[PDB]
Amino acid sequence: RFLKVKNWETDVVLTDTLHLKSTLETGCTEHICMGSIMLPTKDQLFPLAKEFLDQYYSSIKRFGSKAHMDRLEEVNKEIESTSTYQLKDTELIYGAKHAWRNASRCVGRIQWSKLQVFDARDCTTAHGMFNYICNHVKYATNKGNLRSAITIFPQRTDGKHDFRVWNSQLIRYAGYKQPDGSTLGDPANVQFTEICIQQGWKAPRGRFDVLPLLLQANGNDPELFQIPPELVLEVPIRHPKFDWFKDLGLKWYGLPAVSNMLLEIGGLEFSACPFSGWYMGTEIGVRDCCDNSRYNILEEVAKKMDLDMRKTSSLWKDQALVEINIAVLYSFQSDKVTIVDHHSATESFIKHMENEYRCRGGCPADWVWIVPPMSGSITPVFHQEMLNYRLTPSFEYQPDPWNTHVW
Amino acid sequence: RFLKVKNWETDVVLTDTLHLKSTLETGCTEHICMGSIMLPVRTKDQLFPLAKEFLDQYYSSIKRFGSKAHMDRLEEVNKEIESTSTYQLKDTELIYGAKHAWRNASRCVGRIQWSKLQVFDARDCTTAHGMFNYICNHVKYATNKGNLRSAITIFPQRTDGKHDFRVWNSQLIRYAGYKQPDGSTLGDPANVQFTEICIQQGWKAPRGRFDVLPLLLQANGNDPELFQIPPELVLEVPIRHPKFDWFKDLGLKWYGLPAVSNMLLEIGGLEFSACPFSGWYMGTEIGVRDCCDNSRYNILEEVAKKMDLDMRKTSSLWKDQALVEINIAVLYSFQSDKVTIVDHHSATESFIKHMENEYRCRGGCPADWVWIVPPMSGSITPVFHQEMLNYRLTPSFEYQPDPWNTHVWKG
Ligand code: HEM
Ligand code: HEM
Ligand SMILES: Cc1cc(N)nc(COC[C@@H](CN)OCc2cc(C)cc(N)n2)c1
Ligand SMILES: Cc1cc(N)nc(COC[C@@H](CN)OCc2cc(C)cc(N)n2)c1
Ligand SMILES: C[C@H](O)[C@H](O)[C@H]1CNc2nc(N)[nH]c(=O)c2N1
Ligand SMILES: C[C@H](O)[C@H](O)[C@H]1CNc2nc(N)[nH]c(=O)c2N1
Ligand SMILES: [Zn+2]
């Protein structure tokens, strides 16, 4: 029942008890591990509310207090009367921070308690959503000195009046199928681009076109808005040694901002809750630049470096990969846009895991996501056993809305 | 039931049905995943079902399921078990069994090769000297002057658990490690405890950086005995770099033959506690782990220094740069000396083709993503993008306790 995790590099063993709280299911059974799979009423609501409020009142050292019992009763009466309830500001903020704290796939959680929470529960229209999001973008970007933020739109009611940001991130680049047969821009974003075009967006048909926002308020049909260009901070990619690197014409945007997830707090569902931090360099240099189905630039870089590409065993892919990742970190640092390298980030996560074990009795972590997509075993998380389990408040995946929306 | 796995780079979806044949437990539950945990005497009554399921699988594989030969063999095994408490595998069943344990090894990226395995039957072995001779022959056969051949040697199965055959070494060939009084280590820090055991048992340690350990062998539950592998049978490759002429002066070399000797082979409920097996290396096993783990030879700094990398900040990626160069050096050296090695790109590409073939012809391929993905350049290998299902099929290779923890010393 009490489980140990071992670090195989340092021999340090930690005991996990926090997993006994876990509520949701993992996808695994005693017969089969699904660790590597990417996506595996009034009655229901009150126990979920109670469980959360219990944890909240515990955190402020007022468990079993008058104010604790009074709030529980107040929420009970509210659910019985209205079929739902409203979180106090203090609760919303706690909940948001804890959803991050509980995010098993996030290496950056040492930062979890420094999150700026923007309460957009008063928003009613898509134009309002656009204004809140521009403000989030400008606040988080902070002229390159990035600050973690989440903006929280109104909670789900009957599920026919959902707030959704249709975009997967606040800032991403368009992708277009060419008559040529090749793909211009980001191949990951072809379907969503078509939805935008189909809804009226005038597409520039370039390599690095920032997508408009497609915003849905109160379950109405979504609307297009372009983020003010001057609020989207971008970084041209160059290399400290290779003068030719800039001629590849590569750039990336500074703000990673996930907008397609659902925040669950105390049984309430926040279907539009864009959140942002700052990049770990491999997210851009390994994944965005080098994935076969993304910008896929390994060959072009290898050629400019004049590597022997006739045989895999020359490790030309590996050499080019490192150089691309060097250039990403150098360009962000030179322009003073916050970024963290995978060595620094994983070292921080190990310190954070130790804090969480010491202070909370554990830290749910998904090793498959936490270990960086390059140089895995030269980072300390590679040698760290991790236990993966689901705690609430949480960020959850949810269906893409175009599959779900009735026009 | 059907389970689907998707490849996120190609959108190829595969359907697994083989998982329905899984028996043994994973460690995970519907509430916790233990997929990154490294390590998550049999009654008559339990043995006959295990024998039967294995024999059913064997007979199916030879398209003789339900035949007179199959039925007679079940009966013969049933009678042997009730009369002697155990049974003996036919040579054919043993070969099938060993090949399948490899086929079933979910942490092994090299399984495209599973059907090409030379099985040395050592069940007539009775003494440690006899084990030493079997193992020298395995090493010479497998080495094949650099043209490496996969092989396994199988010593007598467990009886009462008081007469076990064991190879105490974790691999047939490994380098000694010595903790110095000042807390530094000479040689391979992973092998310090075992080196101390070897010295206690009487080994005269050369005390250098690459001393091949002696074999420590236990026959029939007796105290283990020390033997030196003839040096002329131990193929080693000096590590040099194609462009950096200073690389050779780091004084590195590695052995050509990776041979796991500490695992237990389970076939039809029988337990072969001494079953050393060998193939050939994937380059990252040496260049990433053996050379660069902080707990192993740990050479990254010295390499980075010699390359004149900016070592003032991790964000120059000096570690990553030096890591690639070391791994180029390992592949270059093995190739230059005509010692079989495979790079991580080739190996993973071959694994994906193997896995797709298994899904189509066998209904699945249990695989442990945490182990299959190489420890460098993960996402530029096709396995990183492949969803996998991990479950346990028998026959199998299993971990077992280190024998110094369990052995009853005779004196
Ligand atoms: C401040 C710096 C941060 C860093 C360096 C960071 C790091 C990362 C990285 C590298 C990933 C994997 C991304 C991928 O491979 O696609 C990730 C995932 C994730 N992070 Fe963070 N994170 C940060 C901030 C945040 C914040 C502010 C939140 C929420 C408030 C958050 C929540 C999440 C979630 C829910 C995932 C999983 C996303 C998914 O499943 O697609 N992170 N994090
Ligand atoms: C023929 C070339 C082979 C290659 C390239 C290869 C590759 C590998 C690699 C890279 C690993 C992970 C090693 C580690 O990180 O410690 C491994 C694990 C393993 N392989 Fe293979 N393999 C080969 C042959 C074999 C053979 C012949 C067998 C047995 C008949 C086998 C059974 C296993 C087992 C049981 C593991 C898991 C070991 C453990 O848990 O420590 N492999 N393989
Ligand atoms: C908040 C945050 C900070 C940070 N450094 N990184 C992130 C993650 O970035 C967004 C991620 C969410 N999975 O999206 C990238 C992506 C793209 C594609 C095509 C698939 C996928 N799963 N993920 C989020
Ligand atoms: C047969 C075979 C072929 C091949 N290419 N590689 C292997 C595996 O190599 C041996 C491995 C077994 N995991 O041993 C390395 C090791 C060392 C230490 C200190 C711990 C550990 N778990 N593993 C085995
Ligand atoms: C199949 C596998 O789960 C998938 O490719 C994963 C692996 N690990 C990952 N790790 C991170 N951080 N991000 C990812 O998108 C993925 N993708
Ligand atoms: C804790 C973690 O499971 C451990 O460090 C693993 C990860 N993946 C691995 N993969 C391989 N091939 N070999 C290993 O030793 C490990 N070690
Ligand atoms: Zn699992």
Swiss-Prot record, chain A:
Signal peptide boundaries: none
Domain of life, per lineage: Eukaryota
Residues reported in the UniProt entry to bind heme b: C106, Y397
Binding site for (6R)-L-erythro-5,6,7,8-tetrahydrobiopterin: S36, V368, W369, F382
Chain positions recorded as L-arginine binding sites: Q169, W278, Y279, E283
Post-translational modification: Ubiquitinated; mediated by STUB1/CHIP in the presence of Hsp70 and Hsp40 (in vitro).
Compartments, record wording: Cell membrane, Sarcolemma; Cell projection, Dendritic spine
Effect caused by changing Y279H: 50% decrease of nitric-oxide synthase activity
Tissues expressing the protein: Isoform N-NOS-1 is expressed in brain and colorectum. Found in the Auerbach's plexus of the enteric nervous system. Isoform PNNOS is expressed in the penis, urethra, prostate, and skeletal muscle, and coexists with the cerebellar nnos in the pelvic plexus, bladder and liver, and is detectable in the cerebellum.
Entry function: Produces nitric oxide (NO) which is a messenger molecule with diverse functions throughout the body. In the brain and peripheral nervous system, NO displays many properties of a neurotransmitter. Inhibitory transmitter for non-adrenergic and non-cholinergic nerves in the colorectum. Probably has nitrosylase activity and mediates cysteine S-nitrosylation of cytoplasmic target proteins such SRR. Inhibitory transmitter for non-adrenergic and non-cholinergic nerves in the colorectum.
Oligomer and partners: Homodimer. Interacts with DLG4 (via N-terminal tandem pair of PDZ domains); the interaction possibly being prevented by the association between NOS1 and CAPON. Forms a ternary complex with CAPON and RASD1. Forms a ternary complex with CAPON and SYN1. Interacts with ZDHHC23. Interacts with NOSIP; which may impair its synaptic location. Interacts with HTR4. Interacts with SLC6A4. Interacts with VAC14.
Recorded domain comment: The PDZ domain participates in protein-protein interaction, and is responsible for targeting nNos to synaptic membranes. Mediates interaction with VAC14.
Family: Belongs to the NOS family.
Stated name of the protein: Nitric oxide synthase 1
Lineage: Eukaryota, Metazoa, Chordata, Craniata, Vertebrata
Residues of the full protein shown: 299 to 716 of 1429
